[PDB]
Structure 1
Amino acid sequence: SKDEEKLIQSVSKAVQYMAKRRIGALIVFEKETGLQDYIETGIAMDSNISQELLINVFIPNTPLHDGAMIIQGTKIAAAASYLPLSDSPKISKSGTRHRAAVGISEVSDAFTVIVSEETGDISVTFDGKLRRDISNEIFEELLAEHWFG
């Protein structure tokens, strides 16, 4: 819908911004698995969403950059939350934010996007499986589909 696409653009434009600037980011989009347990380990925001706020949160050396940001519907549920970590061998040993995204994907049906601190690649995790280095067009397609759809 017309309003849903503004949010996809807001999110998609923020991760592209952080991709080029090499800012690591970890954003969880809640489906039907309740993530209120993982929200409560972070800082509550209950915030509306905007490309500018998404970028501010993940600025390095800031309080909210540490941990995952959790989205519930149209609002920022929390920032700086910690997700559990998977120990599966398929994970390449070459980041923790990648560990956290797979972790939450094994324990929930959430859709998580990761931007790599070192490479700037856009990766996603859902259904316990990591999808690495996807293009922006592919990312918007998947985000639209898992987030609303």
Structure 2
Amino acid sequence: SKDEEKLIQSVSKAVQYMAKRRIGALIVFEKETGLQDYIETGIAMDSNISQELLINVFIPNTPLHDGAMIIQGTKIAAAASYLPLSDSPKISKSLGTRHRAAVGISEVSDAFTVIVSEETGDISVTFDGKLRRDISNEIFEELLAEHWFGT
């Protein structure tokens, strides 16, 4: 749908902007597994999605930057949520807490999560327990549409 396409672009442009600036980001998209428990660890927003708000949330040294944004349908449910951290040895001891968090939530839920690395600006995603690293902008948009909306 047209409105779904608008939302994919909003998220994609935000993720691309943060990747360019090497702004760390962690955004979880709820699917079938209810994430209310993790949402309640963060700051409740129930906010509409925009490129501008997504970027604002993750600006370094701001109250909402640390932790995960969790999106439920067309709304931002919360920011600065605490995800569990994976103990997988596959996660290079080099990789930061955000990656461990993204894999962590993917181990205990069917959520689709995007991570922007603050070191490299690489875009990665997790789902079904596995980190998929350093994907292109075009592939991120394709996977996001698939997992978020099923389009």
Gap runs ≥5 in structure 1: none
Matching residue of 1:111: 112
Displacement of 1:69: 0.2
Q: Which whole-Å deviations, capped at 9, do the CAs of 1:79-124 have from their partners, x for residues lacking one?
A: 0001001101111111000000000000000000000010000000
Offset, 1:125: 0.2
TM-score scaled to structure 2, two decimals? 0.98
Deviation of 1:5 after TM superposition, in Å, equals 0.3
CA distance in 1, matches of 2:137, 2:16: 7
Residue 56 of structure 1 aligns to a residue whose secondary structure is: helix
Superposition deviation, residue 14 in structure 1: 0.1
Counterpart-to-counterpart distance in 2, 1:91 and 1:97: 11
Question: CA offsets per residue over residues 17-53 of structure 1, 9 Å max, x none?
Answer: 0000000000000001000000000000000000000
DSSP-derived class of the 1:70 partner:
strand
Q: How many residue pairs were aligned?
A: 149
| Corresponding position of 2:11 | 11
SS in 1 for 2:69: strand
Deviation at 1:10, TM superposition (A): 0.2
3-state secondary structure, aligned to 1:64: coil
CA distance in 1, matches of 2:107, 2:57: 25
Question: In angstroms, what is the RMSD of aligned CA positions?
Answer: 0.3
Partner of 1:66: 66
Structure 2 portions without partners, runs of 5+: none
How many angstroms does 1:64 deviate by? 0.1
- The DSSP-based 3-state class of the residue aligned with 1:123 is strand
CA distance in 1, matches of 2:111, 2:76: 15
Quote the Cα distance in structure 1 between the aligned partners of 2:130 and 2:90: 10
Tell me by how many angstroms 1:145 deviates.
0.1
